Every structure is written in structure tokens, then in C-alpha cells.
Amino acid sequence: KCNTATCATQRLANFLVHSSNNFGAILSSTNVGSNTY
């Protein structure tokens, strides 16, 4: 794993590259057992 601006950004890029595993799967929060808390 990485957490630097040079790498986490790449991880970010992979989060939004297709997003097929994240795209309001995690971020929407309303869909994770309704937890926007």
C-alpha cells in the first residue's frame, strides 16, 4: 500500500478508473446499510 501524493493519487486513479467496485458502492453510504454517519 502507499499513502504519498505520488501514489495514493494513483490509487485514487484506480478508484475512479472504472469504479466497478466502488461507484456508489462505498461512497454513496446510503447503500452500505444506510450509513451516512
Side-chain angles (χ1 to χ4, degrees), residues 9-30:
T9 44
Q10 312 311 331
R11 313 302 298 175
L12 283 181
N14 292 209
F15 132 87
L16 106 168
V17 61
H18 293 264
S19 297
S20 309
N21 284 272
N22 259 210
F23 57 358
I26 172 178
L27 57 87
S28 297
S29 304
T30 179

